[PDB]
Structure formats: C-alpha cells, structure tokens
Amino acid sequence: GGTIARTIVLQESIGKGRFGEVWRGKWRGEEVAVKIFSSREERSWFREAEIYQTVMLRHENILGFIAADNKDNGTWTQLWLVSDYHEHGSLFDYLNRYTVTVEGMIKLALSTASGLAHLHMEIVGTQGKPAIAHRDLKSKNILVKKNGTCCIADLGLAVRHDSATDTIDIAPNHRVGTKRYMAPEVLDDSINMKHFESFKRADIYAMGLVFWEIARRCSIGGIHEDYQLPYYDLVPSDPSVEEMRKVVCEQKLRPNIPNRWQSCEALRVMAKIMRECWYANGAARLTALRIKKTLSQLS
Ligand SMILES: Cc1ccc(Oc2ccnc(Nc3ccc(S(N)(=O)=O)cc3)c2)c(C)n1
C-alpha cells in the first residue's frame, strides 16, 4: 500500500489557510505537518506540489517538503501535502508571542533573506534550479524553527523562470498575493509581468515590511514596540487594493521607522535595509543576495 498518507495519523487541527486545511500529524512516530485539500482544490494542490518538487529546491530556510499524496477515507478523496513540522508556527505567531534579542532579530532576518536568496537564485545545469519568485511573502508564510531560524513556506503562488527561453512557467494573474504586502507596482498594475526581475523585486518590498515587523520586537534595555502588521496605522484590517494603493502609491507612505532604532547599530543596519526595500522603483531595491551578505557581515 501507499507509504505516506496511508500511514499518517492526524492529531491536531492547526487551521484553515487560503488553500488547504492544516493539521499536525504523526508519521512513523515523527511529528509532521499536513495540508489537506479537497478534490475541487486539485489545481492549488497540484501547483503547490509542483513548486515544492522543483529540482534542487531544498535549503534549510525553505520548508522541508516530504510528499504529495492521495487519501481515500471510503467516502471522499483527500489531497495531501506533507511537510516537516515546526512547533513555533509562523513568524507572525512568534513575533506576537515573543520579543527578541539583537542576536535573535539578526537570525530571523538573515535566515529569511537566505531563504529568499535561494528561491531567487538560478542554478545552471541539468539538475540546475530555476529562479523562483514567491509572490505572497509575509510573516504568516514564514515558519520559525526550534533553532531560532526561519523557513519560507506557502509556495503555492510562486512563479518559475525558464532562463533558456525567458518565459515564466505560468500565465500570471494580476494581484494574487496578500493585499497589505503587495508592492506599489502591483497595487497600481504598472508591474511588467513579462519581466521576471519584476517578480523578484516585489518579493524584496514584502521582505522589507517583514523585517520591519521583526525589528519592532527587538528588545534592547527593556524598550521595544508592540507587535503590529505593516500599515496597521494607515489602513483597516482586510484592506482593499484601493485602500492600500492610496497609502502606498498616492500618499507614498511606508511603515514608520522609530527614533529609538538609530541608537543601535543592528537596528540601524536593519532600518537602512527596510528603506532600500521600500523604493517605489523596484530597480533601485536591494537583492536578497545583497541583503544576505549585509546581515552576514553584521552578524
Ligand atoms: C506543504 C505544507 C504542509 C503543511 C504546512 O503547515 C505547516 C508546516 C510546518 N509547520 C507548521 N506549523 C504550524 C504550527 C502552528 C501554527 S498556528 N499559527 O496555527 O499556531 C501554524 C503552523 C505548519 C505548510 C505551511 N505547508
């Protein structure tokens, strides 16, 4: 019989995501995480399985993928994505629960940037990995390991670049990601979707907003800021594209960078990075590689 879903016992409901219900389960004694999709969600299940099975994807800062599989309970069929299980949940959950040291902030920002750098990087060869842009990077799509480093997950909305023919592996649909985290050029539809670099640039804007989320919780001498999502001060919960666009593109606002942060060297390097991810012109933004180097030198 099958060697995956067949032998997995589900233990705890984690919650309903955009696509896929998440569960914590047990696989030959080991804790695993399982995304369950229904048969009418086959497209999203397949696409996410496809991305995670990209040659040479595995990296310690991308979620460790185990298998896609089917499970027939006798009444209906379930479509399964199985992965490593991370007890701390998302970077969102961790930043709400906890404050971090300077050491902790740098681990979270570095590991995240290393994950994105791996995604973005083309590796030549037959086993060579295609460049990949996430398209929905946000604190809820990044998980926190026990060792205090991040890994990027929820790769269902990702696009892959064929550098041989300069084509993207899907016919992309405008504005698929989380509205709050969409880059300006996404919010106003000026993004050139027939340029793969444009997708990598949108990811960098989103990562800047995530770094901001982290930096707020770095507690030095007792001083830290409460957890907020980006633009908590400017837009409602569940903001519309129009609400986001009026703030990010018309009023040209970005999350606030507190005075406190220029006191410390680490927060000053982080603050400089945020601003250099938040340019309205994607071309001027830092690359994930360049950000990885900087946080490596800082650490
Ligand atoms: C392919 C796949 C399978 C499962 C999965 O879900 C996971 C994977 C790894 N770790 C977790 N852990 C986790 C634990 C708690 C919570 S929370 N926020 O509901 O407490 C969220 C995620 C979930 C994801 C994102 N992708």
Side-chain angles (χ1 to χ4, degrees), residues 264-271 273-274 276-285:
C264 180
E265 168 61 9
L267 296 177
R268 181 153 72 260
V269 176
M270 287 282 292
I273 291 176
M274 289 172 220
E276 294 176 5
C277 301
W278 289 343
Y279 295 131
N281 195 339
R285 302 176 190 156

Side-chain angles (χ1 to χ4, degrees), residues 14-15 22-23 33-35 48 52 63 65 81-90 93 97 143 153-154:
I14 298 302
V22 185
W23 290 76
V34 180
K35 235 172 201 190
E48 188 165 356
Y52 272 112
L63 173 71
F65 180 81
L81 305 176
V82 187
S83 82
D84 299 336
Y85 175 63
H86 294 301
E87 201 188 355
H88 283 308
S90 69
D93 303 310
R97 280 190 203 102
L143 297 153
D154 285 276

Side-chain angles (χ1 to χ4, degrees), residues 79-111:
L79 305 176
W80 278 37
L81 305 176
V82 187
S83 82
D84 299 336
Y85 175 63
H86 294 301
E87 201 188 355
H88 283 308
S90 69
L91 179 69
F92 183 79
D93 303 310
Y94 188 92
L95 264 29
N96 273 260
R97 280 190 203 102
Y98 301 114
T99 68
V100 313
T101 60
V102 179
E103 191 176 355
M105 173 182 59
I106 296 168
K107 272 209 209 157
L108 299 168
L110 184 53
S111 57

